[PDB]
Point group: C5
Chain length 307, copies 5
């Protein structure tokens, strides 16, 4: 009941797709299992590269198809290398790059919790078993990571489990237990660009949106919160043309609705202060002077945003 080593070198994890929950991973995969002894030219082991491997299968070598369960479609395999020993054992070495799937919650946006995953499990093979799992993360921790999109918690996180397929094949004297390596890697998004060049200027206009109350005439207080409407809208443009499309409202995606509210707030006060009186045109004495009373009723309800 065959024992199989696995070793997986991660080289880079790059470019997350955000709609599709996808991330590209590049590296090396290595499997060792001890086969019945063999004469090797010389008597030091024999090295078989790329083209040649398929030939030794035709001659009758067993090599197990190991599959990435959570890959998307098929991957890109670089250099196949079967290195096989005189004492039998055989070591499969493969460079690869391929797209991978996993759940990704992008709601809490520019402060992002995230985790990357590979799952590897033999394709056609029941009781051949994944022995022990290795994972060598070349990528470096508290490094120059302020040059990378992501920071990595985090060191490689293994787990070799057993998998039961209910609806299965046509031979079940107790035989639906496949051996699956699952490899996890934790990460957080580099909240830089999104704060400085993105959260803040939202604030600055969300801010200056309130100085509509320090306007004099009523006719001025109105027509200014209209080219404040346009300022919000044309800022949600600069959102779309930079930010990654999603199907949930994000953090930022809310701060932008906060905009549209604190201005449709304005319009329902300024257009209140002018017709709540006791004569013709007498703007309400205090209502006009919430000048700095609903910014601390925003930073208030905006600390209800933090709820």
């Amino acid at each position: 009941p065959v024992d199989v080593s696995v070793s997986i070198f991660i080289n880079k994890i790059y470019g997350v797709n955000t709609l599709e929950q996808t991330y590209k991973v590049d590296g090396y995969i290595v499997a060792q299992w001890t086969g019945k002894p063999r004469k090797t030219p010389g008597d030091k082991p024999l090295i078989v590269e790329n083209t040649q491997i398929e030939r030794w299968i035709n001659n009758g070598l067993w090599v197990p198809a190991l599959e990435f369960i959570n890959v998307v479609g098929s991957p890109d395999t670089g250099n196949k290398r079967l290195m096989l020993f005189p004492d039998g054992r055989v070591i499969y070495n493969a460079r690869f790059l391929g797209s991978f799937s996993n759940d990704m919650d992008f709601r809490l946006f520019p402060f992002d919790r995230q985790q990357f995953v590979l799952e590897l499990e033999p394709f056609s093979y029941n009781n051949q078993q994944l022995r022990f799992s290795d994972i060598q993360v070349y990528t470096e921790n508290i490094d120059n990571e302020e040059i990378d999109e992501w920071w990595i918690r985090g060191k490689a996180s293994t787990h070799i489990s057993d998998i039961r397929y209910d609806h299965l094949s046509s031979v079940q004297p107790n035989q639906n237990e496949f051996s699956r390596i699952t490899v996890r890697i934790d990460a957080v998004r580099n909240p830089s660009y999104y704060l400085w060049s993105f959260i803040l200027p939202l604030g600055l206009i969300i801010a200056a949106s309130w100085s509509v109350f320090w306007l004099e005439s009523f006719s001025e207080r109105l027509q200014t919160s209209f080219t404040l409407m346009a300022t919000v809208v044309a800022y949600a443009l600069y959102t779309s043309n930079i930010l990654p499309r999603l199907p949930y409202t994000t953090v930022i995606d809310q701060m932008i609705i906060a905009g549209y509210g604190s201005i449709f707030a304005a319009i329902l006060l300024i257009i209140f202060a002018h017709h709540r009186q006791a004569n013709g045109v007498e703007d309400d004495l205090l209502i006009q002077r919430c000048r700095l009373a609903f910014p601390l009723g925003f930073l208030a309800i905006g600390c209800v945003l933090v709820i």
Copy 2:
């Protein structure tokens, strides 16, 4: 007249193309049919992986080309595996990912009715027949589905039918009846993002578009509905730069024409109220004060929109 099992594991259905009526599906396909008995090494069945399969065809194995009828072009096949038995029967196992076609009505937009489809039918083979059809939906129902683009009605919906090709081949002693499995899967769009960060702020400026009537002077009522025109237009920008291009006006695509109207409404009242009088410059006493009479003539005709 050959019996064939089919089993189809759906893994994910992802990324709908909206122009093209297209959706990518990833999973496993499995076919079993019982062939004339055979000696297998050992006497437990024999497993043939990937490369090797083509070899056994050249040796004289029958394996039927089964075709996805509604695929777009060709798909991406991962791990071919012929598992064949001593008592004859043969089980074909294949990973796959491929683009698929089907009609999709996107009119009623951000509240979307939708259904996904595969059709599978033998390519060259008349009376060989698809026995019984299985379909195992790994994807999960009322799950964390508010992380996914789509919710799934819905469980797998089968149907094995017979297909008649009129204009056909050059042998017709009654022989144009091909066996087609049709698999259906129902879905609805996750109306989240489109409501909160998209339908609502349309409403809020559609809304505040009416406070042009609570303006005083005639000269102010005009020039304000002009930087209200610009507000609508620059909001249909944020539409294009987020929403999926189509060839029909959608729901949202209408609420945006509603905008252009309730402002070209304004311009044909404000420019009416000033020159319908009995002197020089006397703004019509009641016409000016439909202030909240055509918003409930909008929400009125906008409940004719719901007709």
Copy 3:
């Protein structure tokens, strides 16, 4: 001098590329020619699928390379199937999807005249000849075609011609006449989306662009046609971010220049009406009141647009 049948099933024609004059077509291609008789296992004809075809070429089967003349690069062939008979004749069946070229005049834009084309002609073969040409259009006419980008005139339009290549090979005892099937299919663009959500709102602001004349003061008539300049420009934005790039001015692409004109009209009247007088500041009595005299001098010159 070999006779060849052709039959071409169109499944879908989808996604036109507008720069490149390109359109993807998916379907089945079938060729039948009668070859010297042959024993078939059993004595009912023999069916050869995919992999196997190349083998029978190596054994010495003739199968003619037929080429799509106007394809772009190479296409995507799905299921090859050689079905060959006891009485000799052979039937080649292939699924395919591929990009195709043809001239396409996109000038008269959202009211588009268009035609799709395949040309098929034997690649290496002079006097082997295309017998009779068939074309089965699965796609349906006055259907639910308001769900599709295109309406189809129109039924399949054939034509088997002969082609002379001047500068040719190194054997010319009268031998440069290749047999080419040409298949045409007519279409018109679904002028929906472009009318309602696109031509009309252009009109509504082209419209309200004229109510700058029903402004009072001179200082108002100016500064309003400036945030009317911006309204046009920011509307041609919503053009670019939706419409397909081209190298000619279209219909819509003109109505947008019409905009820039009827406002640089305004600026060259309003800035005329103020300095054509007989004193200091006396706005010209009638010139100011072309209020509705150059809209019917626009719809006039705009019915010279229809010239």
Copy 4:
């Protein structure tokens, strides 16, 4: 010392990449060289299509790898066809489409001088020689070329030269002279779209930008050249969302900097005319009235732009 014919049919040259200096070319390539005589089935020459060619190489046919020097990566080869004669000579015929490199100066933008290139030279072969070079341009001259992106000067322009590689292989008894065909084709950009729907409206607002001087009050002259700043900026938007990114300022790319200047001109005159006086608030009598003195100081310095 082997003689080789070449003939190159161009079918289309399409889609220039502007950053990358790249253009796709589709067509046929043909090479003829006379080899030692051979018996052909029948005695009319023998035609070898696609698959089969590789076989005759394995049997011992010489076929020289000819390489496109300036291709990008590899190209897409359609139909290989070896047609070989009884008297020896062999004719290679190949369909192809492939990306090509060449220097391209895009500075003088929408009036573009340009030239397309292929370079073809044997890959492993020193003294085998390209005999005479042919080039058949199917594409047509002063045709309906106002439907195409480009006009073609111009007829095919050949040149068969010799190439010396300095640092070279490990056999140099005078042997580093490779035979390279260079084919050139001249072109000009279709300056339509870019004039009418693009250079002109830039002019019309660059124009109306000057009517800020025909404003009355000082307070009006300022605040209007501010929603003129915004008009320029939001027009350089419509530039980015249509025009092809480059790393040099183009023609148009300057006319847009001309905009920003003739408005920061305005601001440094209007804000000069108000504080250059001999009292409190007396706007300079003549300075205010350069009303049409720096448009002919623009069209002046703008005919220094033409320098």
Copy 5:
């Protein structure tokens, strides 16, 4: 212990990906190592092209898989050519184009320091050794490099090192030292387009943003810095739709936050100058007249930006 020559012709380095830290490189790769002598047809060396190479491996030729360590996935190999000598030695020649990885600091943006890299090291082979490394840069220095995205410091920069893999294979009598060529090439970004059509117009509106202080009334000083807010925001639009997305704030990306500040400066002075007095409405005598006191408090703190 096998000696191997290497020679690497760079043809072009093009299209940097900015998120992914990636750049495409096209050229030729050549390896020579002297093998045990051999009879060559004729007795001049023997040339083996493309298809044929794999055959000679099957007959028993050693050819070492050399791997680009920092490639992304796999590359695009054009023309394989084994040229092997009578005296033994063998010369491998290959055209290639492939994507490459390396750290890239894009912070100091439009004035960019950068370096391109290939690393080449034998894949399966320990003590076979890379002899001496060559690198021929066809691309030209202080050339017409103002037509190219990049300038090249700089001539090819070699280095042949030894690499130790800690966690390694299952044979360690001192054997984990692989021979790696590292090739470097220096570059700087062509700061043209980004200065003239991009840094300057930012300045010009950053500039004219200050002429809000040479406004008269308080009510004017406010409502003008609001359509100055919109001017900044709609200019950061023209940034997104041209500039390459990154995860750090760049140089330009800061000058844009500088904008938002020097306007939220304005709003926090103009709204200060009006309510810091000693009565009803008396605008502060000097505060109003920092007219040209915080531009030299900007160019001041903006020479703290240069810190």
